[PDB]
């Protein structure tokens, strides 16, 4: 069941005396005329303070239990009252999921690591809040479903615990021989102070236009007139981002697809202009035996862009693809094609055995294996001078200790995986200084009308 508070859950925001002074405050209060649960018990939330009333000439309500997990592995508070007196306690517990002669206390079964102890009809209201490691408790004491009236709640306790709280419960005395739960929100109120300094009335500056007027004037009696109280501002929904086309899509279908690629020693470099780049055609293109991005995210490619992108091409052997990578060594990544150590593109390679290999040999794909000095990052060399290994001049003729540096793959169809010709296309990304350059396409947010928002 649910019930309606009327004007309930007002507490003194702090010390400091005070008299007749319609004083205005901003704090966490229980709004007037609220929807308070009814109970005749389970784990509730906390989320921001709690109002809590109860009624009974006997004492069935015997304290609460607080915390995040209400068990071990994290700390919690426990506030109890046997027929003797209150027992605050802070340990790590093990709480019964339903915790509750005159013999009693099946509440918990563990009291480890205690970091705080303490020992020593009717309507009993309480306000519990928890700010900056302090757990504040206000309470009242007014004797006769709730009724209707005003009664401000006076501070009781202050505990410098540090505990986190997300949940709480209640404790009841069984049979062997009614309570409510509100929540608190940040409101602004206008409290009327007596001449002795007690709060006798209040106004919930956030209810009906009358209360907002009382709040604006800082009073409990408004005289006839007309008062400006606030403002009305329509609200905008969604954010429509308009922009221009970009048609010219990445001419990627001209580099991946040409009838012939170039050999490794003299690779082809086709540089991309300023357009829109669609990688959805390559990502869903083919088997792609190897596809490793290093700098940019392969799954979010459509969200970044840079000034200029570069696309290289060559044809390397099978077991040498593992040398097209930042920081490798071998006959391929030292004399023919070296990648810098701050690479930012994406290397991709797929099998091309049935296209670039013919029977009886295919001697049209070369690779240089003799160079006097290792290659610096991103340099291309097309020299064909005789590499001279010994000490005798040879003036440019093949023979002894003077070898020709260009040799050709013997590509044939009856090879094992690791010697079949593979095609490679290495992309590189770069942002020097240009503000608006080649960039990926997005979604043209439709344009709406007769609706303000953004």
């Amino acid at each position: 069941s649910y019930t309606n508070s009327f004007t309930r859950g007002v507490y003194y925001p702090d010390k400091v005396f005070r008299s007749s002074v319609l004083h205005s405050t901003q704090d966490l209060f229980l709004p007037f005329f609220s929807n308070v649960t009814w109970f005749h018990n389970p784990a509730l939330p906390f989320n921001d303070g709690v109002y809590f009333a109860s009624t009974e000439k006997s004492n069935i309500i015997r304290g609460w239990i607080f915390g995040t997990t209400l068990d071990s592995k994290t700390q919690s508070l426990l506030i109890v009252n046997n027929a003797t007196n209150v027992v605050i306690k802070v340990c790590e517990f093990q709480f019964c999921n339903d915790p509750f002669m005159e013999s009693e206390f099946r509440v918990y079964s563990s009291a480890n690591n205690c970091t705080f102890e303490y020992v020593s009809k009717n309507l009993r209201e309480f306000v519990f809040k928890n700010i900056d490691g302090y757990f504040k408790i206000y309470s009242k004491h007014t004797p006769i479903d709730l009724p209707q009236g005003f009664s401000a709640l006076e501070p009781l306790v202050d505990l410098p615990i540090g505990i986190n709280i997300t949940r709480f419960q209640t404790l009841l005395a069984l049979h062997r021989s009614a309570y409510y739960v509100g929540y608190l929100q940040p409101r602004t109120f206008l409290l009327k102070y007596n001449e002795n300094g007690t709060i006798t009335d209040a106004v919930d500056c956030a209810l009906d236009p009358l209360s907002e007027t009382k709040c604006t004037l800082k009073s409990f009696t408004v005289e006839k007139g007309i008062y400006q109280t606030s403002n009305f501002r329509v609200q905008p929904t969604e954010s429509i981002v308009r922009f221009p086309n970009i048609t010219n899509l990445c001419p990627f279908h001209e580099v991946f697809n040409a009838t012939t690629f170039a050999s490794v020693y003299a690779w082809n470099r086709k540089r991309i202009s300023n357009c829109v780049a669609d990688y959805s055609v390559i990502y869903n293109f083919a088997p792609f035996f190897a596809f490793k991005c290093y700098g940019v995210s392969p799954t979010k490619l459509n969200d970044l862009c840079f000034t200029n992108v570069y696309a290289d091409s060559f044809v390397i052997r099978g077991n040498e693809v593992s040398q097209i990578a930042p920081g490798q060594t071998g006959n391929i990544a030292d004399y023919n094609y070296k990648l810098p150590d701050d690479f930012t593109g994406c290397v991709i390679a797929w099998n091309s055995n049935k296209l670039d290999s013919k029977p009886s040999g295919n001697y049209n794909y070369l690779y240089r294996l003799f160079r006097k000095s290792k290659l610096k990052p991103f340099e291309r060399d097309i020299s064909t001078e005789i590499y001279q290994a010994g000490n005798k001049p040879c003036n440019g003729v093949a023979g002894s200790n003077c070898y020709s540096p260009l040799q050709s793959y013997g590509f044939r169809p009856t090879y094992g995986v690791g010697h079949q010709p593979y095609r490679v296309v290495v992309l590189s990304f770069e942002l020097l200084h240009a503000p608006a350059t080649v960039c990926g396409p997005k979604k043209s947010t439709n344009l709406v009308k007769n609706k303000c928002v953004n």
Partner: protein, 49 residues
């Protein structure tokens, strides 16, 4: 004077107001401290400039 945190200057005088038994100091309209309670003896004293 310094009253457990309240730092100020002025003449202190015996009061005849009555706080509630959890209130430490009193304030005026326009928000200036004008009364305190002595922590040890628990009596209210006015603070005039």
């Amino acid at each position: 004077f310094n009253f457990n945190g309240l730092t100020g200057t002025g003449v202190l005088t015996e009061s005849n107001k009555k706080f509630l038994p959890f209130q430490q100091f009193g304030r005026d309209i326009a928000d200036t401290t004008d009364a305190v309670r002595d922590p040890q003896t628990l009596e209210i004293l006015d603070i005039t400039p």
